[PDB]
Structure 1
């Protein structure tokens, strides 16, 4: 009920609850439960500490929040100080995968700034 240093929900099913960890989605959660021999429909409550310990050992094999944010930020920072096109686009805060920018770039640009 506490995995990877964060508290995961309890009333939720195990396969859903595991996704709360930064670095684990639905498929990775399924793979974890399969390796640990735990059914997907069981909740985080009414589950033994030994099973939860097996879950911790299984999740340890992957990369989760602590080093994942560090490496993601490191890659983004790498691009920016590297001076590549993606770096310049990142520092300017615009879409980097070659999207249109004349309109529909709201997620990277935030809410509209009116002309003054």
Structure 2
């Protein structure tokens, strides 16, 4: 059933049914079900409407989805704008060599590719 960032865990046990969320997994599965008092051997189609409610509110308080991915992008952009080799490593569009890469290097690259 619906829980966090659009998830459709159907025809699965209450356990792994949550182990499909990029946020929670196994450890988080046993803890969330033990705190809300829910059988771990019950399918998601047998779960009452009151059990899922107490499961959504508790799991709601967590970090997931885009808001998290953007933080990753910023973390890869901060060291990218600086003079760090690691930042240039993420790009890899920089010279892999020892001669120049800016120009005169089609002997290894071949036909000029589009910018």
In structure 2, how many angstroms separate the alpha carbons of the residues matched to 1:66 and 1:74? 12
Report if aligned partners of 2:12, 2:44 keep a CA contact under 8 Å in 1: yes
TM-score normalised to structure 1 length: 0.67
In structure 2, how many angstroms separate the alpha carbons of the residues matched to 1:33 and 1:15? 8
1:13–1:91 distance in 2 versus 1, CA, 3 Å: same
Report if aligned partners of 1:4, 1:56 keep a CA contact under 8 Å in 2: yes
Report if aligned partners of 2:5, 2:65 keep a CA contact under 8 Å in 1: no
Give the stretch that moved more between structures: 74-83 or 34-43.
74-83
Please identify which structure carries the higher helix content: 1
- The C-alpha deviation readout for 1:45-90, integer Å capped at 9, x for no partner, is 1111221111111111211223222222222223323443432222
Report if aligned partners of 2:5, 2:64 keep a CA contact under 8 Å in 1: no
In structure 1, how many angstroms separate the alpha carbons of the residues matched to 2:26 and 2:105? 28
Q: How many residues align?
A: 115
Report if aligned partners of 1:15, 1:26 keep a CA contact under 8 Å in 2: yes
Give the stretch that moved more between structures: 86-95 or 63-72.
86-95
Other structure's SS at 2:81 match: helix
In structure 2, how many angstroms separate the alpha carbons of the residues matched to 1:30 and 1:107? 58
Structure 2 partner of 1:109: 109
1:85–1:99 distance in 2 versus 1, CA, 3 Å: farther
1:103–1:3 distance in 2 versus 1, CA, 3 Å: farther
- The C-alpha deviation readout for 1:16-68, integer Å capped at 9, x for no partner, is 11122221222122222122111222211111122111111111121122322
- Give 1 or 2 for the bigger CA radius of gyration: 2
Structure 2 partner of 1:19: 19
1:87–1:4 distance in 2 versus 1, CA, 3 Å: same
